[PDB]
Design a protein around this ligand. Structure first.
Ligand SMILES: [Mg+2]
Ligand SMILES: [Zn+2]
Ligand SMILES: [Zn+2]
Lengths: 49, 49, 1345, 89, 50, 49
């Protein structure tokens, strides 16, 4: 997977809601990953690696 | 490999599933003959004995 | 006589907790030092992990120091260093021990899922670990004081409590504390108190959680174990040879990680022992104790605390738990396989010169295999001086040893096996025939059974050494002894490819050829006519034949006549033996009829004639197939001339729908469907074009102009005979191939027009690619899935084996044809044959017994039942078998590689699982009668309308077509409100209209007649006013009770039938009046005051599959959207709906207590709101839950559900599996049952139906008059049913090893064997088959005097 | 060579006990206690025992009876010998 | 007791819910089910002829 | 043929002696497992006669 930013969906299977989801993922060529993801409550979250 | 004269026809069950019937000519002409070179090593080590 | 002391052949096993003394018993010494060897002259350092004194001598029969080196010295212990001089094998035996400084918890019993110490003490795990780590104090036997027993304290709290009461109170911390807790515990008194408590408070949860624990407790008491032993005092050390230090080339050594772990444990323990003598401060000694606990834990089971790493290597060291568990999922030693001597393997090939009982065995291979036999056979005759000389002889390959090998090879069979073994046919015994070459020659007729191709598949050979193994291989595993599939009685030896093409080309007929019309005296001069090039193979000829029949009693009758046949068929008749009628070979003989020939030959003549017949058939098949000169050219595939037109028209069609999309006449989603439909419809045209242009295409002439017959075209002969290829496959070569689909899963609207014969442009190929890739991946995955299913199935069955002979029960199931949809998706003679009757069936005229009581139904019996019109036979089944812990022969059936009834001791569960799992790789609006018969209405209440028609008032209604014979052909279901033009006992013809209705409408009709009144219908509340704008005819639409107003939501709208007087017309024959309420979104028909009659609708209301399906079935998985059933028979009602859901109030006409359930209203209903429904009726449609079937319908219903569903899956793929196997899987599934009443065992305990029945049946007499307890059958999935096993050794295999071993240990489980898997693990004769006798005899010697 | 054991299976119905009995007989022959009841075609003790089963001149019953008689042969011959052991008193 | 039919994810199943009332059984079901992101489909009373 | 350390040799001798039999025993595997299990606080023993 080429280093850069990548925006995904992950729709259907999450929590049945049909509300889908949206997540951004910043992948470097070296070092830690930076993730930003949503959730059923429409709150924005962040996880390192 | 080597192209050769081939006939499509059942021969006494000898070709049964995927199997192949080869003329004695092919083995006589030494055409499908293959040469292999094996490397066999002998080790002289040291033991307490 | 003295019982015994020393080692005889042992019975069963016992597992339990080990006392410190019991541990010291095994120990032949203590290991006091971490040292291993001497580091220079490598020798065990005394009192080390490796020691000669503690364990054993490094060399056989020699002392360590070297004092006594002679084999004479045995029981002598050396004086310098005590080592008894004995074989070094004892270094694999002798245990050892370690005296621990401070007590140490056994991690298995501490960290187990229930946490055995914890629930024994009724103490939470967190608190126990808190104590062990010296985090907090815990009181023990607090006596009469301020504090309780199990109560935990802290530093300050313990100090203060100590300042108050010095004595009469006790508290400790660490492992010693838990040890004290366990030791002080009185099981008896605690039990008594629990018994007093169980009887006071009446509550489900309380008494359940109480009774479970008291059960566990008394179990622990009777176990013989003791709580103290959960805390380790002495630590056993494993024999050194099981953790070898053995050296390697280059001087480097290698050893087990158990050495590292053990060494750590010893080191830390010694350090603790030193620190105690040094009087170190608490902060130190505590740390050392914790380190000791950590080390010991890491030794026993690593990964439950720190995951300790081995020296110089990152990878975590492998502990004893990991030694027992092994790896590769759940496998422990002999399950996952093992290496075997006297064996080999190689590439496989042809050899049709072979006979069905033999196989080509390479000279060199056979030599190296039977090499030990050759050795003895050489010096037996005196050809060799001694064994060494024999070895030298076969090593020199002296010319004599070949002829000497031919002796040992003669009657000594060999086992041939393939890689993907599924069904028992995967391993078959043959007779060795010496062959020059390195390749193994296999008989062609077996290639079907092995599923082995000639494309470079390899097979393995095994030598049956012991006499018993030879006779087992010859009388059981022999090739000729199995001619039949274990799945179904059909022949597995059926000719495959070239042979069937040969017999096809023989028995085929041509319109005009040499010898047409001429007559022949017999087969001899027929073959003589053909072989001379005089008469053609296929030509119409009358010949004199002599056909026999065995129709006399036990006797062959001879008859002779002139049959009209072909020359080829007549030549073929020279083969077919004895009683078989000439009509068998008189046909074209496709792959089907050629099989039924062999079948009938087996069911008439016998085994031997069938075998020799089969061999002859293969021989002549290959022969004439060779003679046939059949080939495949490029001109053999004929493309339809009209194809190019069919495309164009279709290519026009899409264009139409392409324009309408631009003009907005059609929507996008509609356009897509239109285009895909027309394009897919074109393919059928091209395909059924090429077929007609193929099959009959040959147009020939006989003494005249033209006559056409079946084509002699090669590829077509192949496809039609069954040699290879099929319609779908030839379709891809000639006609267009399919319409591919993008990875999205959606189908592309531009199908592939070109075929394989034609070129393929870039695109088309690129599009075919995804199909190819996904195909390969799919198959590769389905292999694994099939394997797993097979595994689960073998696990759930296994030990089930025929034990008794005849249990003698009239119980069974009702066997009728499946009668699915239009006609008979499977006949009666199939589901019947091979299965012994439960009770004597009768002719249509009664008092006549054709088949008495229980008799195995074979071909003749089933034929007799076929003479008569009988549509049903009651059959004994494995699921209904009264035999406990097994199955009687008279229940199971006959079917096997032989036609005879099932033997005694054969293991049926295994072959059942195999038979189900082997084929599993292949897996993925008005009634109009198709035939002529008489109408029969089953289970229906209806009424006659004012139109003279017949309207059905029943939801569950069946329509059967019973012809003049009295047999049921057609079967359908007729919905409520359907209009029948006929009645029960009527007459219809083929295609005649019987039932009619509408899908989108659920008409609510009226049985009685009169005016229509209106009650509880108020506008704006219950109903609403809507008038059609295209007509002006209206109805007041019933407003659903979700959307209604404030107070109008509480009223139930209805249509009540009134007569001329204004009274209420009652439901016929009852006190109860007739008022039909209406549901939500239900539009009416006629308004108030308007008169109606019967049949007039009061209001009209609007509206997976494959292998994983089988998996879901056998696992009894509840579906996603289950059909709800009526729990209790009665009249349904709708209470006031609540909370987004709807109440459903059932009203029993019989007793009492009207039951109400919560059904979400969004789910579309089924049941009439104002009518009665029996238990098991459908309140809504959709998939049915198996548990619901078992509970609301019954065992016989649910077993039928399973078998019919799984067979619906398999039969759809064209796969034959006898219902038997599935029935045994079912038997294993419902094995468990949960008790209801009491008087012997516990209340809610789940327990085996066999166990429970064997108890209550014993309690129906003697005992108490009957104190016997009621139960309820329970449906368990195959994996959950497999989870239950008496043998802990068997359970240690497929389940989680740790948990099983622990739970079994604390209980003191005694494994009596008696099962298959556990006996295999321990390496003794299987309690079935050959061994069944042995284990039977012993079983009788046991539990007796 | 015996191609199909069906005939043998007909005698003693079973087909597991066929293997047992025929093995027992094959033991009686192979490691010599005795000779066979049927002319040897150069068939091994396996096939010989199976043939003997087919001809119905051998089975479980007959074997047990015969062995029980051999015990009487050996108990006959040993009579004086073991009765000379009265020293036990 | 009362068997509550809960459906979520790829499949469904029934769980025992103890209570003194059908309505109470429903409330105790939802309170002990819904908030986890599990749907509550059905509630049935336990029969068992005795 | 596999796991029995005595069984193998005691067989081979009979194989060459012209005696087809077997004098089986406990496969070294299961015995090793007995030792491994008994290396813990678990006591596993064989009973009766
Ligand atoms: Mg293959
Ligand atoms: Zn010594
Ligand atoms: Zn039975």
């Amino acid at each position: 997977r080429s280093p850069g930013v990548f925006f995904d969906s992950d729709k259907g299977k999450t929590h049945s809601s049909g509300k889908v989801l949206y997540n951004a993922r910043i992948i470097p060529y070296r070092g830690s990953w930076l993730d930003f993801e949503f959730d059923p409550k429409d709150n924005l979250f962040v996880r390192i690696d | 490999g080597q192209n050769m004269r081939v006939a499509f026809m059942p021969w006494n069950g000898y070709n049964f599933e995927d199997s192949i019937l080869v003329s004695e000519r092919v083995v006589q002409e030494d055409r499908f003959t293959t040469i292999h070179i094996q490397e066999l090593a002998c080790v002289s080590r040291d033991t307490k004995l | 006589l003295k019982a015994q002391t020393k080692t005889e052949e042992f019975d069963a096993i016992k597992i339990a907790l080990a006392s410190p003394d019991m541990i010291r018993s095994w120990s032949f010494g203590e290991v006091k030092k971490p040292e291993t060897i001497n580091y220079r002259t490598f020798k065990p350092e005394r009192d080390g992990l490796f020691c000669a004194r503690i364990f054993g001598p490094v060399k056989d029969y020699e002392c360590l120091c070297g004092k006594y080196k002679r084999l004479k010295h045995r029981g002598v212990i050396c004086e310098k260093c005590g080592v008894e001089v004995t074989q070094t094998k004892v270094r694999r035996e002798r245990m050892g021990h370690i005296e621990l400084a401070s007590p140490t918890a056994h991690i298995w019993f501490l960290k187990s899922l229930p946490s055995r110490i914890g629930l024994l003490l009724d103490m939470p795990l967190r608190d126990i670990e808190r104590v062990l780590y010296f985090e907090s104090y815990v009181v023990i036997e607090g006596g009469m004081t301020n504090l309780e027993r199990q109560q935990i304290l802290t530093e300050e709290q313990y100090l203060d409590a100590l300042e108050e009461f010095g004595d009469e109170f006790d508290a400790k911390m660490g492992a010693e504390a838990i040890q004290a807790l366990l030791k002080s515990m009185d099981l008896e008194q605690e039990c008594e108190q629990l018994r007093e408590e169980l009887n006071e408070t009446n509550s489900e949860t309380k008494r359940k959680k109480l009774t479970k624990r008291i059960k566990l407790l008394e179990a622990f008491v009777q176990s013989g174990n003791k709580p103290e032993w959960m805390i380790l005092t002495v630590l056993p050390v494993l024999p050194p040879d099981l953790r070898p230090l053995v050296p390697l080339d280059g001087g480097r050594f290698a050893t087990s990680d158990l050495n590292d772990l053990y060494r750590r444990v010893i080191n830390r323990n010694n350090r603790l022992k030193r620190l105690l003598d040094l009087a170190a401060p608490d902060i130190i000694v505590r740390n050392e104790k914790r380190m000791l606990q950590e080390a010991v834990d890491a030794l026993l089971d690593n990964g439950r605390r720190g995951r300790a790493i081995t020296g110089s290597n990152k990878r975590p060291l492998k502990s004893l738990a990991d030694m027992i568990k092994g790896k590769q999922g759940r496998f422990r030693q002999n399950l996952l396989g093992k290496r075997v001597d006297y064996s080999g393997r190689s590439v496989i090939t042809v050899g049709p010169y072979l006979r069905l009982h033999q196989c080509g065995l390479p000279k060199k291979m056979a030599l190296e295999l039977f090499k030990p036999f050759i050795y003895g056979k050489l010096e037996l005759r005196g050809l060799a001086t001694t064994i060494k000389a024999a070895k030298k002889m076969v090593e020199r390959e002296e010319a004599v040893v070949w002829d000497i090998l031919d002796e040992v090879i003669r009657e000594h069979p060999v086992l041939l096996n393939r890689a993907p073994t599924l069904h028992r046919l995967g391993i078959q015994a043959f007779e060795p025939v010496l062959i020059e070459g390195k390749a193994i020659q296999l008989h062609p007729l077996v290639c079907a059974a092995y599923n082995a191709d000639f494309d470079g598949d390899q097979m393995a050979v095994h030598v049956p050494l012991t006499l018993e193994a030879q006779l087992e291989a010859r009388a059981l595993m022999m090739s000729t002894n199995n001619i039949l599939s274990p799945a179904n009685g059909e022949p597995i030896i059926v000719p495959s490819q070239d042979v069937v093409l040969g017999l096809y080309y023989m028995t085929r007929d041509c319109v005009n050829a040499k010898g047409e019309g001429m007559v022949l005296t017999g087969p001899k001069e027929a073959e003589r006519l053909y072989r001379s090039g005089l008469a053609s193979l296929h030509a119409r000829v009358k010949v004199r034949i002599t056909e026999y029949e065995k129709d006399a009693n036990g006797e062959l009758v001879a008859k002779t006549s002139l049959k009209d046949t072909t020359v080829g068929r007549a030549i073929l008749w020279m083969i077919v033996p004895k009683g078989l009628p000439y009509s068998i070979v008189n046909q074209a003989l496709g792959k089907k009829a050629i099989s039924k020939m062999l079948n009938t030959c087996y069911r008439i003549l016998g085994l031997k004639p069938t075998v020799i017949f089969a061999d002859q058939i293969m021989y002549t098949g290959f022969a004439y197939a060779a003679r046939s000169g059949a080939s495949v050219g490029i001109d053999d595939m004929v493309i339809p001339e009209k194809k190019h037109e069919i495309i164009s028209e279709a290519e026009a069609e899409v264009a139409e729908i392409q324009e309408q999309f631009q003009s907005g006449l059609v929507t996008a989603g509609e356009r897509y469907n239109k285009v895909i439909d027309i394009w897919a419809a074109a393919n059928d045209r091209v395909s059924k074009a090429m077929m007609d242009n193929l099959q009959t295409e040959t147009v020939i002439n006989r003494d005249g102009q033209e006559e056409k017959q079946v084509s002699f075209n090669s590829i077509y002969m192949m496809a039609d005979s069954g040699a290879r290829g099929s319609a779908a496959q030839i379709r891809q070569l000639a006609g267009m191939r399919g319409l591919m689909a993008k990875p999205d899963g959606s189908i592309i609207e531009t199908p592939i027009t070109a075929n394989f014969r034609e070129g393929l442009n870039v695109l088309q190929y690129f599009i075919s690619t995804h199909g190819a890739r996904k195909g390969l991946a799919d198959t590769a995955l389905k292999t694994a899935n099939s394997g797993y299913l097979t595994r689960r199935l073998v696990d759930v069955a296994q030990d089930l084996v025929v034990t008794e002979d005849d249990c003698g029960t009239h119980e069974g199931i009702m066997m009728t044809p499946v009668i699915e949809g239009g006609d008979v998706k499977e006949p009666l003679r199939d589901r019947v044959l091979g299965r012994v009757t439960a009770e004597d069936v009768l002719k249509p005229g009664t008092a006549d017994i054709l088949v008495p009581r229980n008799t195995l139904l074979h071909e003749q019996w089933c034929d007799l039942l076929e003479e008569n019109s009988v549509d049903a036979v009651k059959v004994r089944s494995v699921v209904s078998c009264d035999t406990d812990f097994g199955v009687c022969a008279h229940c199971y059936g006959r079917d096997l590689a032989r036609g005879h009834i099932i033997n005694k001791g054969e293991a049926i569960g295994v072959i059942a699982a195999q038979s189900i799992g082997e084929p599993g790789t292949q897996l993925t609006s008005s009634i109009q009668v198709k035939n002529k018969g008489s109408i029969k209405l089953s289970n229906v209440k209806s009424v006659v309308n004012s139109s003279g028609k017949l309207v059905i008032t029943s939801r569950n209604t069946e329509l059967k077509l019973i012809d003049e014979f009295g047999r049921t052909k057609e079967s359908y279901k007729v919905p409520y409100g359907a209009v029948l033009a006929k009645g029960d006992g009527e007459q219809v013809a083929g295609g005649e209209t019987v039932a009619n209705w509408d899908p989108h409408t659920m008409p609510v009709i009226t049985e009685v007649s009169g005016f229509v009144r209106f009650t509880d219908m108020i506008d704006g509340q219950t109903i609403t006013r809507q008038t059609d704008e295209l007509t002006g005819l209206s109805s007041l639409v019933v407003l659903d009770s979700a959307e209604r107003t404030a107070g109008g939501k509480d009223l139930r709208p209805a249509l009540k039938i009134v007569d001329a007087q204004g009274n209420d017309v009652l439901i016929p024959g009852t006190d109860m009046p007739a008022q039909y309420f209406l549901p939500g979104k239900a539009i009416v028909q006629l308004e108030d005051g308007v008169q109606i009659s019967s049949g007039d609708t009061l209001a009209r209301i609007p509206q997976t599959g494959g292998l994983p399906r089988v998996a879901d079935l056998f696992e009894a998985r509840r579906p996603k959207e289950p059909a709800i059933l009526a729990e209790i028979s009665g009249i349904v009602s709708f209470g006031k709906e609540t909370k987004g859901k709807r109440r459903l109030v059932i009203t029993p006409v019989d007793g009492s207590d009207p039951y109400e359930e919560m059904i979400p209203k969004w789910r579309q209903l089924n049941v009439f709101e104002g009518e009665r429904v029996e238990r098991g009726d459908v309140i809504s449609d959709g998939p049915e839950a198996p548990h619901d079937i078992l509970r609301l319908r019954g065992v016989h219903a649910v077993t039928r559900y399973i078998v019919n569903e799984v067979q619906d899956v398999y039969r759809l793929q064209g796969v034959k599996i006898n219902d038997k196997h599935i029935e045994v899987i079912v038997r294993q599934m419902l094995r468990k049952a949960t008790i209801v009443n009491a008087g012997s065992s516990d209340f809610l305990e789940g327990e085996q139906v066999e166990y429970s029945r064997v108890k209550i049946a014993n309690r129906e007499l003697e005992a108490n008059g009957k104190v016997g307890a009621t139960y309820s059958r329970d449906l368990l999935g195959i994996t959950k049913a497999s989870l239950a096993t008496e043998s802990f050794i068997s359970a240690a295999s497929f389940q989680e090893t740790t948990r099983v071993l622990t739970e079994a240990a604390v209980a003191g489980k005694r494994d009596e064997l008696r099962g298959l898997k556990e006996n295999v693990i321990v390496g003794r004769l299987i309690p079935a088959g050959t061994g069944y006798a042995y284990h039977q005899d012993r079983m009788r010697r046991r539990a007796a005097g | 060579a015996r191609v199909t054991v069906q005939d043998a299976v007909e005698k003693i119905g079973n087909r597991f006990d066929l293997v047992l009995v025929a093995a027992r007989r094959a033991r009686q022959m192979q490691v010599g206690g005795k000779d066979p009841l049927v002319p040897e075609e150069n068939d091994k003790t396996t096939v010989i025992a199976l043939r003997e089963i087919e001809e119905g001149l051998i089975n479980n019953q007959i074997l047990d009876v015969r062995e029980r008689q051999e015990q009487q042969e050996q108990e006959a011959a040993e009579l004086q010998a073991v009765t000379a052991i009265a020293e036990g008193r | 007791k009362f068997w509550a039919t809960v459906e979520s994810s790829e499949h469904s199943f029934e769980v025992p819910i103890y209570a003194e009332t059908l309505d109470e059984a429903l409330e105790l079901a939802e309170w002990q089910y819904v908030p986890a992101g599990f749907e509550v489909t059905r509630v049935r009373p336990c029969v068992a002829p005795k | 043929k596999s796991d029995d350390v005595n069984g193998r040799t005691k067989m081979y001798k009979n194989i060459v002696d012209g005696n087809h039999q077997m004098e089986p025993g406990m496969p070294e595997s299961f015995n090793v497992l007995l030792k491994e299990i008994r290396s813990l606080g678990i006591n596993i023993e064989l009973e009766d006669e």
